[PDB]
Coordinates of C-alpha atoms in Angstrom, one line a residue:
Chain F
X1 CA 278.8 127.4 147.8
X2 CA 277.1 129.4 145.0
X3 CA 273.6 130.7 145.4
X4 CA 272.3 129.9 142.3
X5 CA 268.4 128.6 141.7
X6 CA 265.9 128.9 144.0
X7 CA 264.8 132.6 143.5
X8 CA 267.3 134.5 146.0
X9 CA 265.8 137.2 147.8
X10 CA 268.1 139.4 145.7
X11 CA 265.7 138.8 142.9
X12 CA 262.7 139.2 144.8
X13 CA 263.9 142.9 146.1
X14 CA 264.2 143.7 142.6
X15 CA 261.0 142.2 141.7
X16 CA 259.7 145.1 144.4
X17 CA 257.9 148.1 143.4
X18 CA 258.9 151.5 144.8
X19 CA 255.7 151.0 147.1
X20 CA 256.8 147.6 148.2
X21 CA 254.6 145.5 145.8
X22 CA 255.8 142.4 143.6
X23 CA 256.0 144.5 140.2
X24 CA 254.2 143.3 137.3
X25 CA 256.3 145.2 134.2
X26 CA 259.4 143.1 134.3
X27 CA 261.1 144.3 131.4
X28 CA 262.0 141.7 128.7
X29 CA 265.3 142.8 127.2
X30 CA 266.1 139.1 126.0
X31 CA 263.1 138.1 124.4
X32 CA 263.6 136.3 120.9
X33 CA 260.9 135.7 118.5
X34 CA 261.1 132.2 117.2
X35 CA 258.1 131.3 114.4
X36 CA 259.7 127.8 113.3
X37 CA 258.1 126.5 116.6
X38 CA 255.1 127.1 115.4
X39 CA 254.7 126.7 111.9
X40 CA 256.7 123.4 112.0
X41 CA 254.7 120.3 111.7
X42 CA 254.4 117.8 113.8
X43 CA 253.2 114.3 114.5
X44 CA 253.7 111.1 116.5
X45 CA 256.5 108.5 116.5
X46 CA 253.5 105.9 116.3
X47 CA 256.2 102.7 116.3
X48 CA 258.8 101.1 118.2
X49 CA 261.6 102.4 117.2
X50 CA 262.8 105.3 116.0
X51 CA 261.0 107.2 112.6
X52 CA 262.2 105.0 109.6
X53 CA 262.9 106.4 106.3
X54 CA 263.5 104.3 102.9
X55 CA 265.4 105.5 100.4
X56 CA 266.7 103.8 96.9
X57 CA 270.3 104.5 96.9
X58 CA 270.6 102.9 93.5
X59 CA 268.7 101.8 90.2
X60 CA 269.1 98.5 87.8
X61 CA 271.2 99.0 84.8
X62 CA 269.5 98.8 81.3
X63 CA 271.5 97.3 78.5
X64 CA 270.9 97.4 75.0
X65 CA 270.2 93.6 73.9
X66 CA 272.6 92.5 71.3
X67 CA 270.5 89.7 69.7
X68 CA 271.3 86.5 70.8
X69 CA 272.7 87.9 74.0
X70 CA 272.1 87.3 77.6
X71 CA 270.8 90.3 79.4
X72 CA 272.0 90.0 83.6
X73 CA 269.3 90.3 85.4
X74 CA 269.8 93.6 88.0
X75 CA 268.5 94.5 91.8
X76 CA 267.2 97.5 93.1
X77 CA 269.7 98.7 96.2
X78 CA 267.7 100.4 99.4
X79 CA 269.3 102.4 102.1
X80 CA 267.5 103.7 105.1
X81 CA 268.0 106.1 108.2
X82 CA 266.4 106.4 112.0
X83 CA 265.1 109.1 113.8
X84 CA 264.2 110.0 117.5
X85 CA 262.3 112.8 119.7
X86 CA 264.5 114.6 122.2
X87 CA 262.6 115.8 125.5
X88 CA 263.4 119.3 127.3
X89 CA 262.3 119.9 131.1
X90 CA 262.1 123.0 133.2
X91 CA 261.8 123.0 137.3
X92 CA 260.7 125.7 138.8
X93 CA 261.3 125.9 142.9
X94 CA 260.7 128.8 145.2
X95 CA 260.2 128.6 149.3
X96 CA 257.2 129.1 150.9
X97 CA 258.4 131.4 153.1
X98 CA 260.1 133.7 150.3
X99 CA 256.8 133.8 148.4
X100 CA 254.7 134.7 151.6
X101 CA 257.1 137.5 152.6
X102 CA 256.7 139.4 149.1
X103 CA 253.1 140.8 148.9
X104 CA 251.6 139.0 146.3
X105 CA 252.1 135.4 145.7
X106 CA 250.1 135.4 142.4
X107 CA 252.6 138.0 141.0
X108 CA 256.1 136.2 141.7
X109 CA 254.8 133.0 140.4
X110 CA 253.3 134.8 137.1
X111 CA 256.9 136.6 136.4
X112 CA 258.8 133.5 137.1
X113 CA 256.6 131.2 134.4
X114 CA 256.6 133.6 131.7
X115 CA 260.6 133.7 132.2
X116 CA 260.3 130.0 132.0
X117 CA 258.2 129.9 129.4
X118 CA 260.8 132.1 127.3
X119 CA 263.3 130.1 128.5
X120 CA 262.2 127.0 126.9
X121 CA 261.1 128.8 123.7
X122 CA 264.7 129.8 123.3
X123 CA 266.2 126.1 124.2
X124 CA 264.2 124.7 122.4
X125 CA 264.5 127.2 119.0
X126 CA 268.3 126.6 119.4
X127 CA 268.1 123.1 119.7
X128 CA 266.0 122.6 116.5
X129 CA 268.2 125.1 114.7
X130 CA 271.3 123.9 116.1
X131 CA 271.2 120.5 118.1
X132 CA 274.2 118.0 117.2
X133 CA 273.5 114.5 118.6
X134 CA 277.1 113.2 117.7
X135 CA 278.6 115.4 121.2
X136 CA 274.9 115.1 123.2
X137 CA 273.6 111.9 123.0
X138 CA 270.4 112.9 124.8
X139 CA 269.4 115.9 122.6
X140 CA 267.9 115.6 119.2
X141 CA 269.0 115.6 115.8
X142 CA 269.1 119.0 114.4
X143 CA 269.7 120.9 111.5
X144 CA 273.1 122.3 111.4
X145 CA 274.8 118.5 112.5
X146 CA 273.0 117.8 109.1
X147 CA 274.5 119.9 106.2
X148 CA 277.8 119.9 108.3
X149 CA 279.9 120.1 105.1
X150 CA 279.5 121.8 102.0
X151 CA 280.2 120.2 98.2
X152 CA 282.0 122.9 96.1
X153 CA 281.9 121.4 92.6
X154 CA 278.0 121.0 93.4
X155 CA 276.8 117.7 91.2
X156 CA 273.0 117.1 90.4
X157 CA 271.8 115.4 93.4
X158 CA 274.0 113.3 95.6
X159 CA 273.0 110.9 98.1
X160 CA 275.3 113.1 100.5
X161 CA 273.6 116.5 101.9
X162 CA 276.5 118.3 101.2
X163 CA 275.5 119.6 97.5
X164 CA 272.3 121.0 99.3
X165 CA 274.5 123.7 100.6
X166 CA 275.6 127.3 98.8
X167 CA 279.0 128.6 100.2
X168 CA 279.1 132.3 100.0
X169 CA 282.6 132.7 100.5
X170 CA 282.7 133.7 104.4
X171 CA 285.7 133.2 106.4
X172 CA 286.1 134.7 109.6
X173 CA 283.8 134.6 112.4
X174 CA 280.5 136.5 111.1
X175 CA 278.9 133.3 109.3
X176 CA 275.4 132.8 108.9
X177 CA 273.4 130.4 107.2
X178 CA 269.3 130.9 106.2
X179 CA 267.5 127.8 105.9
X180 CA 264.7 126.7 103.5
X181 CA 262.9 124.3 105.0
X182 CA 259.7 122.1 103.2
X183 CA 257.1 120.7 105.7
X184 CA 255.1 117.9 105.1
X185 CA 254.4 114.6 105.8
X186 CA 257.0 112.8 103.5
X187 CA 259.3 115.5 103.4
X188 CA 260.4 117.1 106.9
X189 CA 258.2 117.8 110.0
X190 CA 258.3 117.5 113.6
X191 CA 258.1 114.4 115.8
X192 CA 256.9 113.5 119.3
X193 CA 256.6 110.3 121.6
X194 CA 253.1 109.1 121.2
X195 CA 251.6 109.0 124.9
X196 CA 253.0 112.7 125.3
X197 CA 251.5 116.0 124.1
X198 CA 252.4 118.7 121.6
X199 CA 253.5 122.1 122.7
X200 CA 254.8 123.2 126.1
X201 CA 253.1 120.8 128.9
X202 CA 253.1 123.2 132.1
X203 CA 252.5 121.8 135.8
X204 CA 251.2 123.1 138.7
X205 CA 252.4 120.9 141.1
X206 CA 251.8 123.1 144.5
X207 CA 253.5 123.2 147.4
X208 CA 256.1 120.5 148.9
X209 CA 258.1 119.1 151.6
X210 CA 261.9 119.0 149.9
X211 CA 264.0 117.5 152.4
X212 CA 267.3 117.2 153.0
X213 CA 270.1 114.7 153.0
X214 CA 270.8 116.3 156.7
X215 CA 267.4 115.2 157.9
X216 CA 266.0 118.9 157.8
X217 CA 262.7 119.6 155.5
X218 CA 260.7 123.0 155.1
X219 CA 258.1 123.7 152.4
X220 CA 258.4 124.4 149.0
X221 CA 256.2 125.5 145.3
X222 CA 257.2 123.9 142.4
X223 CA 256.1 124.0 138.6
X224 CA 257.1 121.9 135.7
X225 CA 257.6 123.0 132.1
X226 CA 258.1 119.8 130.1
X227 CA 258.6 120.1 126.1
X228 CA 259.0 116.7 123.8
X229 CA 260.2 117.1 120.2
X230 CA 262.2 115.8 117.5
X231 CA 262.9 116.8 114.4
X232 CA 262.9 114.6 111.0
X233 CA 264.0 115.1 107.7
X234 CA 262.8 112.3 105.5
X235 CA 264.3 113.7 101.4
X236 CA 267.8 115.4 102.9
X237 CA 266.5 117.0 99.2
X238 CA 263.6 119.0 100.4
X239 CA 265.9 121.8 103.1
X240 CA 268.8 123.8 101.4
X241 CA 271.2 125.6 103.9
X242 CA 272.7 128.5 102.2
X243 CA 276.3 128.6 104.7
X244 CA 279.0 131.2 105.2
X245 CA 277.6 134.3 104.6
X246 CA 280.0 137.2 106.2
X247 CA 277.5 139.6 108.1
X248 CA 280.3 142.5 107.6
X249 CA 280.4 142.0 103.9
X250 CA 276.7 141.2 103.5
X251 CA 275.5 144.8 105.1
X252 CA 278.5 146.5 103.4
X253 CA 277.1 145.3 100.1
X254 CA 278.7 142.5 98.7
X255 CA 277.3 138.9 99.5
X256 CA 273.9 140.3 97.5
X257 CA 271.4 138.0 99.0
X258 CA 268.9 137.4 96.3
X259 CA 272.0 135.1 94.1
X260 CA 272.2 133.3 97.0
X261 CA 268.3 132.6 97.5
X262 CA 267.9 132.0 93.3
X263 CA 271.0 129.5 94.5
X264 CA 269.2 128.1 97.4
X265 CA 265.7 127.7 95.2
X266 CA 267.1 125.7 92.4
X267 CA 268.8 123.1 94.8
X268 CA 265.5 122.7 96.4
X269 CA 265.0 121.0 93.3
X270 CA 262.0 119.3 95.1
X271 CA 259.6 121.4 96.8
X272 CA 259.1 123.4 93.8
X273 CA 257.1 120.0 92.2
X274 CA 255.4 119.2 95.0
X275 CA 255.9 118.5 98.9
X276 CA 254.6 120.2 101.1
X277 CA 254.5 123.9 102.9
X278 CA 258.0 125.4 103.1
X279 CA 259.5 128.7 104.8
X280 CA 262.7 130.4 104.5
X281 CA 264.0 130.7 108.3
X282 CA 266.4 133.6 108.6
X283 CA 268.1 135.9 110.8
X284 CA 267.7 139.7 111.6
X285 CA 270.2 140.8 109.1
X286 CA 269.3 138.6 106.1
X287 CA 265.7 140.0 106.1
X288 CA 267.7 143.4 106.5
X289 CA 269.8 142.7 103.5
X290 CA 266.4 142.0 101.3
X291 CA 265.4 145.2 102.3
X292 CA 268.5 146.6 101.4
X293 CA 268.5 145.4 97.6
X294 CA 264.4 145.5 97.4
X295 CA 264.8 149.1 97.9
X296 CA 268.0 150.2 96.5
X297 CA 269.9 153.6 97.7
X298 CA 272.9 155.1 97.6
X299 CA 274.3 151.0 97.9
X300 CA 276.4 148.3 96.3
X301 CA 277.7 149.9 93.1
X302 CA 275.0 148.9 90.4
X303 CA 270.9 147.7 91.2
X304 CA 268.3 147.0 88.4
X305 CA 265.1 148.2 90.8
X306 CA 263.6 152.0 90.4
X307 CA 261.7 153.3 93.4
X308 CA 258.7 155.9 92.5
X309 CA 259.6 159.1 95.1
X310 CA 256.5 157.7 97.8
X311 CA 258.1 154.1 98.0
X312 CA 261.9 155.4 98.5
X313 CA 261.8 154.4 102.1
X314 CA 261.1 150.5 102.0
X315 CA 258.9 148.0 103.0
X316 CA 259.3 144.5 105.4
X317 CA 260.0 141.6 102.9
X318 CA 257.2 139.1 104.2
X319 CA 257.3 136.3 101.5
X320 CA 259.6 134.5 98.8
X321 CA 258.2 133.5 95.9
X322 CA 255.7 132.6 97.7
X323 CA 257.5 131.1 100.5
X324 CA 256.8 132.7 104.0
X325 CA 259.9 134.6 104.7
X326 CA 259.4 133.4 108.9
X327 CA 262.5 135.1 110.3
X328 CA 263.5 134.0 113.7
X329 CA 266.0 135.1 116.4
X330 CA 267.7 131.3 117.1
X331 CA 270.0 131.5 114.2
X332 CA 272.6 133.2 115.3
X333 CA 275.8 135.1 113.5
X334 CA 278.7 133.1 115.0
X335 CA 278.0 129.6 113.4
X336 CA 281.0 127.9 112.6
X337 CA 282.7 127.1 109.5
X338 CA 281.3 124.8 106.8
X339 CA 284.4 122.7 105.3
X340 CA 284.2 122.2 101.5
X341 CA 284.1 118.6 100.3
X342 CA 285.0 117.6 96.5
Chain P
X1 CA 272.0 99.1 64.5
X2 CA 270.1 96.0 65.3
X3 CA 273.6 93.9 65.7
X4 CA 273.5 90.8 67.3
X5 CA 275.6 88.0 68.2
X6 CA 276.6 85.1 66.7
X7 CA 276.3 87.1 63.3
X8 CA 279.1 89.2 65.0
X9 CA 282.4 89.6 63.2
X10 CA 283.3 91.0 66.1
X11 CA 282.4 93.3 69.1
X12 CA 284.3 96.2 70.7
X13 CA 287.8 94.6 69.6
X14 CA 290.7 96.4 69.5
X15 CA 292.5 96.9 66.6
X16 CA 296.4 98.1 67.9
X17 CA 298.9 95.6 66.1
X18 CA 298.4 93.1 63.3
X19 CA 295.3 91.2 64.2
X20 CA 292.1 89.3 62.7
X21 CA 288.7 89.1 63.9
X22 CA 287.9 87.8 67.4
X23 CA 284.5 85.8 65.8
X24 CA 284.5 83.9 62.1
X25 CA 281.5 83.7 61.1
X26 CA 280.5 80.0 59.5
X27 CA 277.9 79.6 57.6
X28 CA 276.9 75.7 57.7
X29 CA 277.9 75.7 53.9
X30 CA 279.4 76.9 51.3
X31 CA 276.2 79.0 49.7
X32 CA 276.0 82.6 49.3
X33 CA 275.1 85.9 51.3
X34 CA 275.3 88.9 49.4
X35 CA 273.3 87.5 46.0
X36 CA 269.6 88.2 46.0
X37 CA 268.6 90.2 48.9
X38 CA 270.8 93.4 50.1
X39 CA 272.8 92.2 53.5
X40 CA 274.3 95.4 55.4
X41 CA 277.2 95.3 57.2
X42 CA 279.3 97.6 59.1
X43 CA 283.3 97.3 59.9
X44 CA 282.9 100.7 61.4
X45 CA 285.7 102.3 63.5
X46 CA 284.8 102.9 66.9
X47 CA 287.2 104.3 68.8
X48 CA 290.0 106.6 67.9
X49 CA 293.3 106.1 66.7
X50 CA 296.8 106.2 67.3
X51 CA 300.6 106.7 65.3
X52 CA 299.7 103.7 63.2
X53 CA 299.8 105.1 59.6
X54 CA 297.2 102.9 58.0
X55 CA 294.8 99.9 58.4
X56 CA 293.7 97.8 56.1
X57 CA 290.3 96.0 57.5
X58 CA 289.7 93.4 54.4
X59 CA 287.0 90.4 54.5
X60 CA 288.3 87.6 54.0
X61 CA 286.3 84.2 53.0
X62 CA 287.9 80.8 52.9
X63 CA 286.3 77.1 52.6
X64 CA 287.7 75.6 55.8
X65 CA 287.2 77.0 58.9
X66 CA 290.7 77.9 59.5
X67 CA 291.9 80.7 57.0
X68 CA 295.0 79.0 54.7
X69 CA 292.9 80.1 51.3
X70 CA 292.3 84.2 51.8
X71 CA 290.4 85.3 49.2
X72 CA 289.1 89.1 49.7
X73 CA 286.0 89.8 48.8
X74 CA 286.0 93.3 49.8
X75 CA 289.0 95.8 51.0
X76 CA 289.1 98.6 53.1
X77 CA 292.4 99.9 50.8
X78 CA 295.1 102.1 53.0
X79 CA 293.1 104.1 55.0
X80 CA 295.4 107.2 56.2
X81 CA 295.8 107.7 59.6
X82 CA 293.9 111.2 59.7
X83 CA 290.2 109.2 58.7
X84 CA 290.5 106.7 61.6
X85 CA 287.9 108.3 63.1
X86 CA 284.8 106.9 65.0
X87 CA 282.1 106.1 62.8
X88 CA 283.9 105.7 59.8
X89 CA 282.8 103.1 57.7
X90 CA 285.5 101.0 56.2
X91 CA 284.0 99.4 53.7
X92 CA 280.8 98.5 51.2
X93 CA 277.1 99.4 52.7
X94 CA 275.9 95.9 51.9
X95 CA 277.8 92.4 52.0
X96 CA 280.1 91.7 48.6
X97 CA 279.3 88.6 46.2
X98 CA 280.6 84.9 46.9
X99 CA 281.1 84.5 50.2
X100 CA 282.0 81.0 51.0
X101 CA 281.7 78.9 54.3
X102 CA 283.4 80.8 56.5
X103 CA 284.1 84.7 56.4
X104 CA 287.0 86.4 58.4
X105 CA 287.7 90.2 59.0
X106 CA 292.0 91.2 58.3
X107 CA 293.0 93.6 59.9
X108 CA 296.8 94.8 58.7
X109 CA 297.8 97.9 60.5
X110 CA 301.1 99.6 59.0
X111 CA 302.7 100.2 62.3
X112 CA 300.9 99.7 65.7
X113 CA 299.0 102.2 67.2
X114 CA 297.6 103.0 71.2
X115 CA 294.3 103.0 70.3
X116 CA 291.6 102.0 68.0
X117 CA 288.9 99.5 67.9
X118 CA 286.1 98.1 66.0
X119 CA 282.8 96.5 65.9
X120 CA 282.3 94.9 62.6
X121 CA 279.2 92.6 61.9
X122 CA 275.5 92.3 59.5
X123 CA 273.0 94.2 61.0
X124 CA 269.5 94.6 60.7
X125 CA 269.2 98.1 58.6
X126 CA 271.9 100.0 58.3
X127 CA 271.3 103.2 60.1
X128 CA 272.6 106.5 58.2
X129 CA 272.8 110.1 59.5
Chain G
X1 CA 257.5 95.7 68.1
X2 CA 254.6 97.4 70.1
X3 CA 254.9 101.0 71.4
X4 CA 256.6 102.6 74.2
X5 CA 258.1 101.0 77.3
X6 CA 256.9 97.5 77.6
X7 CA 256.3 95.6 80.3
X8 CA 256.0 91.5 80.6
X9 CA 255.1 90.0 84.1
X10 CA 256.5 86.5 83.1
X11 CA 255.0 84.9 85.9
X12 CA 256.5 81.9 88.0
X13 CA 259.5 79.9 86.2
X14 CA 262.0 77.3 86.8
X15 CA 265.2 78.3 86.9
X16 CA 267.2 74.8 86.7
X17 CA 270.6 75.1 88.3
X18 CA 273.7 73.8 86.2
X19 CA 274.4 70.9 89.2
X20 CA 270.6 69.9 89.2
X21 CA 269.2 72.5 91.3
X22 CA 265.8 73.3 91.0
X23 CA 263.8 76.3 92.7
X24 CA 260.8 78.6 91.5
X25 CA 261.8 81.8 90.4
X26 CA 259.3 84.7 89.0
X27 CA 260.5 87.2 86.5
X28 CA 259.6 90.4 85.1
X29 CA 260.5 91.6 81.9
X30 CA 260.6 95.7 80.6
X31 CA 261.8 96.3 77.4
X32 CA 261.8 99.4 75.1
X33 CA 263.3 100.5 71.4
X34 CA 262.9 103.6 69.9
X35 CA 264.7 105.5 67.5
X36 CA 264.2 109.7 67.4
X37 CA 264.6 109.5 63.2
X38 CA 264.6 113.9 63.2
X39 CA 262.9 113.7 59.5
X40 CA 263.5 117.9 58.8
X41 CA 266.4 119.1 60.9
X42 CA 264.8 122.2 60.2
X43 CA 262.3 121.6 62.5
X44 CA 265.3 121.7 64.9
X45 CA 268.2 123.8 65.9
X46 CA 271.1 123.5 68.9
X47 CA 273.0 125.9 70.4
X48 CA 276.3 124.6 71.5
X49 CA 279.4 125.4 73.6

């Protein structure tokens, strides 16, 4: 019924030059820029099972010795929490004869993996940033399944991830969230299947024979574009998800970001001792917003930041405090709500 | 404090309604405590109190282990109600002369408050401030 | 008393059962007093509230 996969000939005419020849500047209109993938850290399963984490989820009570009285004698309570990788896979599958009717067979093939190449950046980018495992089962767990609910009355440090979260007050349907994540060995980091490999494993297969349940075969090229990963946070302590930030209000002036990152800092109570490298993962607009109060203009209704006359214009934010301010294009601005919890 | 049991008047009772002291204290004999070298002790208020408009926390000594001779050899007088505060102490810094076998802590509330407790008892230095 | 939080590794022990159990235990002891004594609350002030 549908014509989907398989590179239509459709394509291929518009893959044409104006002389005839398989063009070589496909525009890239959709083409995000996602640095998580690569400054994450990563490392092997190297066990059984899933990644296992221990955690004390309570301490011995002290008492104060009235003489001549019996002291109890107390335990030390663990609690602990799994992990897994999830695994991504691309086919790519053309015709023979399609490929040999366009001029160049080098060309079609080299358009078609960079798109898949893309393609899987962007999966997998959203997947990291957003992957619940509770309604997949086969994908990995993410980021945004964690931190699902926000604590209002935030206490010190809960065992629950929910007082790791700011709420900025959004609503409606603009809601973003930037992420500070710490990278490290103990803390948070990447994971893989040991026997795989790291990064994008591409394949070169050739051509084939695919058949058909009707007994007919013909040739056909295929490629492979395989990707392994899962994602592990160890101290739910060591990433703070600011949440519910209203895009609208946030450009108009009133969600002033740099509250919500001195918010987002202190809660990464961690970190700031020790850990590990972090980042600060963020959107298009939140980097636009620290522009907008590093540079103040004609904005908000009161700033504390003069601009000598040759620096009225602005500079790109590039770091926090030290923290690599690695913006990427897989958050998005239509995340949904985050409840509050008491 | 340095408190300690059994040398305990009493620990975190409470004091609502005309009551005595959970622990009596018995000394073996009849000799003495507060002769020679100082003996602290604290019947301290605790907690808060209540309506009750007095208390009247006295330590009372007796020869036989059950209290039918009261003899007081120190009194707390009628405290008001507005001083039943925590950390009040009730009565003398060290432990009055001629205490007997066995020593009790009275205490005669005039009406009966909600709240209020004590932990009365010899520590090991009385701590001030 | 010696200084700061103390720390006893009692070693192996006996533990007899009130019905004539018997089985090795081992026990560990901390223990720590103190007392903060401010000698010239001059030397300290608090801002409250």
């Amino acid at each position: 019924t549908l014509g989907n996969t398989y590179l239509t000939l459709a394509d291929v005419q518009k893959q044409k030059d104006g002389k005839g020849n398989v063009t070589s500047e496909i525009i890239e209109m959709l083409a995000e820029t996602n640095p998580i993938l690569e400054d994450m850290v990563v490392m092997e399963c190297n066990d059984g099972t899933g990644h296992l984490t221990t955690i004390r989820t309570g301490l011995p009570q002290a008492t104060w010795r009235r003489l001549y009285e019996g002291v109890q004698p107390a335990k030390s309570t663990t609690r602990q929490i799994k992990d897994s990788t999830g695994t991504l896979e691309a086919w790519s599958e053309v015709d023979e004869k399609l490929v040999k009717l366009s001029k160049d067979k080098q060309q079609l093939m080299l358009n078609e993996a960079a798109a898949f190449l893309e393609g899987m950046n962007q999966t997998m980018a959203s997947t990291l940033f957003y992957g619940n495992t509770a309604t997949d089962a086969v994908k990995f767990m993410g980021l945004a399944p964690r931190f699902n609910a926000y604590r209002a009355a935030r206490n010190l440090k809960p065992v629950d991830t929910a007082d790791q979260v700011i709420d900025a007050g959004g609503t409606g349907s603009d809601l973003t969230s930037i992420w500070m994540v710490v990278w490290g060995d103990r803390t948070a980091h990447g994971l893989y299947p040991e026997g795989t490999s790291a990064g994008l494993q591409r394949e070169y297969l050739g051509a084939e024979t695919k058949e058909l349940g009707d007994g007919g075969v013909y040739r056909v090229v295929r490629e492979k574009f395989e990707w392994d990963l899962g994602l592990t946070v160890r101290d739910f302590r060591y990433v703070v998800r600011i949440a519910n930030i209203d895009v609208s209000d946030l450009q108009a002036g009133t969600i002033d970001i740099y509250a919500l990152l001195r918010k987002a800092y202190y809660r990464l109570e961690n970190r700031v001792i020790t850990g590990g490298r972090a980042a600060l993962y963020c959107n298009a607009d939140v980097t636009e917003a620290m522009d907008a109060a590093a540079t103040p203009t004609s904005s908000t209704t009161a700033s504390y930041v003069r601009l000598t006359p040759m620096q009225v214009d602005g500079k790109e934010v590039m770091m926090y405090r030290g923290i690599p301010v690695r913006e990427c294009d897989a958050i998005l601005s239509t995340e949904t709500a985050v409840p509050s919890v008491a | 404090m340095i408190m300690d049991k059994e040398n305990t008047f009493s620990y975190k009772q409470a004091i609502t309604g005309t009551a005595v002291s959970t622990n009596v204290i018995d000394l073996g004999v009849s000799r003495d405590i507060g002769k020679g070298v100082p003996v602290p002790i604290i019947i301290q208020v605790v907690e808060d109190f209540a309506d009750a408009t007095s208390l009247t926390a006295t330590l009372q000594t007796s020869e036989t282990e059950n209290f039918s001779s009261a003899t007081t050899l120190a009194t707390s007088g009628a405290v008001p109600v507005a001083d039943l505060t925590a950390g009040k102490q009730l009565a003398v810094q060290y432990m009055p002369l001629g205490t007997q076998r066995y020593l009790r802590v009275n205490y005669t509330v005039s009406g009966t408050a909600t709240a209020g407790a004590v932990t009365a008892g010899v520590v090991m230095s009385h701590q001030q401030n």
